[PDB]
């Protein structure tokens, strides 16, 4: 697979729901909200109309990074694009291809790893919403972008991964050789440094080197702060083989307190070498 | 609207002065000091002799990032290039173009988004003088760089933008279609994440991709730490139209405590849709 | 002087973990010669390194590496039972690969870059104790044709110290104007830092050096960094600025104020640094 040229006009329904544990989630269907919210994938040029409904007892909003949107889809109290309790609103996101402007410069596409989150709960910056779990990924693909066997979203939200209690992963499974895509988002108050054992990627738009003349740095550790978003694709177990490969924040008290999960890379027979589930507790 | 080749020897007078309620700033003429300090632009290859005068009762200095300067223009007490009270000094900053060295490798030029600040007030690293307002931006352009319709300078200085009180901006104005340049400098103790609503830029030298071969990440949110500086040009309203477009620090307590302003992009008739002055 | 050659050799080294004075711990290649930072390990892409490792201490220790290819048995984590018991021995194997075109048409990133190793088991199962105590070291993987330097120096921001040195005690590095000097910068611990050098700059890419006039990497003199970040650059000492006691420091204001400063002592050909008086520093 490779992404095709874009330009489809899409629609979807989206709800903001209270979840258990005092949380809040987005979902595509009533009663199916998740944390992180649902992954929205677009190709450059597609438009997405989001038929949005607020099912909670407090205003909420939908603010997106990186995608074209007019002020009316800003998703803020400050230009009256929030959604009252029980209210509804259609947010529109647009994307565009890159190309030469008439002044000679190059307009950058919308392609990239982006995200969306609340901007209204708690404060007019969505501090309460984001803490509760109102966030999710948006991938915009360029025509020709290689496509992954799977996509996993890792959000460092304050001292949590995906709002989970400490040392509860999440874990992610792949088989040696799968092309795995990772979307990494950070939210909240703290900086973090995302690290993956056994695996590395290029610090560019795709996480993959364009070819032999890409000078981007190849890393396995990146500092990130609130609302940063990047992603990459790795071949699971490439050059290293199967195993329970940790990913964690490398800030030493963060990993000690539980900002750790496993990238479980399995042999073809589905087993994991030297993976004693209880030696990782 | 493109930068020319440099090589001109330029001179400017700068002054350090005190300002109201504890603050201090640089000025091009006395009485006229500002926080941030004056924007300095140069073309790669230019030399700049800053004829500097400290009008304050305490020592001060002028230290610059990225530009060429000999150790005597270090702007540090450590190297004895600070400026005593009432004193004067001439700091020389030079720039160069990119080109191939003798050893055959490529030497990077001076072009970039840079800044200058005090290095001796409060501490030997400027801690009290940076806190007080003693910082400013420097742009060095390469030959061929497209020139903006405006440049606006945003300094995250601890928990403030441009040492301004919380929730007071600043706001900048443009018209849809304007090529707008933002200079972003961070100072103090805190990390930040700069975010702009409705607009995006490439994470490279200019903030614009070189072309279809430029693999630089395109972003709208950037982590920055003390003495980081970067800049970019955007077409205002490009693909998103007019309106009051927020920029802020995206650390949640920071934006909550007031690290937020507006990029007011106006329709050619001058009105901003949706905006509530 | 010159270029990195093509890799492919299988190298062996003995490495030791040893107690050092002051409650510190260090790696070394020979007994009694442990250092903080540990020894610089240098490989070319394709090289294999069998580290014959010995733990001379009374507590468990491990060797974990960033960026290189290792199988999960050389993870160096208690979690995967690749730590070394007090008095114990273990051969860690690190591999590197050249970049190249995969059968799927994408470009495989090579191992080349500025990497580091460190402990993963001392104090906590994320090595928080052994990293505090000085168990960390640089690794450089060179791509064929990489420019070699006249000298390489390693600067590790470890918590609020540089190379575990007392406040304001450097270290200092000396070069002559025109020397090609390689800096390897690693960060560790709990804190974010910004690395700054007076009178010098580099490219934010793999080598630190612009590949040519087509390379768009930002050129910087100041770089935010977090725990386990590792980058490097080569500069021409004093190029366009002359001899001098050029400070490098973390630019987080209170960090420099309280010790995170050192000196790049760049000398004229006659050995002099005019104006340099250590008592003013
Ligand atoms: O506000 O993101
Ligand atoms: Cu916002
Ligand atoms: Cu963290
Ligand atoms: Cu690791
Ligand atoms: Cu945001
Ligand atoms: Cu901030
Ligand atoms: Cu936003
Ligand atoms: Cu500075
Ligand atoms: Cu680890
Ligand atoms: Cu620091
Ligand atoms: Cu400096
Ligand atoms: Cu300095
Ligand atoms: Cu590590």
Numbering used by the authors:
A (entry chain B): 41 to 321
B (entry chain C): 41 to 317
C (entry chain A): 40 to 320
Paper text:
Laccases (benzenediol:oxygen oxidoreductases) are copper-containing enzymes that catalyze the oxidation of diverse compounds by molecular oxygen. The active center of laccases contains four copper ions: A blue (Cu1) mononuclear copper center (T1) and a trinuclear copper cluster (T2/T3); the latter consists of the mononuclear T2 copper ion (Cu2) and two T3 copper ions (Cu3α and Cu3β). T1 acts as a center for the reception of electrons from the reducing substrate, while the TNC serves as a binding site for the molecular oxygen and its reduction to water. Three-domain (3D) laccases are monomers consisting of three cupredoxin-type domains. two-domain (2D) laccases consist of two domains and exist as homotrimer, with the T2/T3 located at the interface of domain 2 and domain 1 of neighboring molecules, and T1 located near the surface of domain 2.
We considered that the replacement of the His165 (“gateway” of the proposed tunnel) to alanine could fix the tunnel in an open state, and the hydrophobic phenylalanine should close the tunnel. In the case of substitutions for phenylalanine (H165F and I170F), the tunnels were closed. The structures of SgfSL, and its mutant forms with sufficient occupancy of copper ions, were obtained via the cultivation of the corresponding over-producer, the E. coli strain, in a medium with a high concentration of copper(II) sulfate (1 mM); in the case of cultivation with 0.25 mM CuSO4, the laccase crystal structures were deprived of copper. In line with our hypothesis, His165Phe variant showed drastically reduced turnover rates for ABTS; its catalytic efficiency decreased by a factor of 255 compared to SgfSL wt. Oxygen consumption decreased 6-fold for ABTS and by one order of magnitude for K4[Fe(CN)6]; no activity was detected towards 2,6-DMP. We propose that shuttering the T3β tunnel in the His165Phe mutant may impede copper ion access to the TNC. This would explain why saturation of TNC with copper ions could only be reached at the increased (1 mM) copper content in the growth medium. The shuttering of the T3β tunnel likely impedes the access of dioxygen to the TNC, which would be in agreement with the fact that both His165Phe and His165Phelow Cu variants were inactive. Thus the Phe at the position 165 may hinder the access of both dioxygen and Cu ions to the TNC via the T3β tunnel.
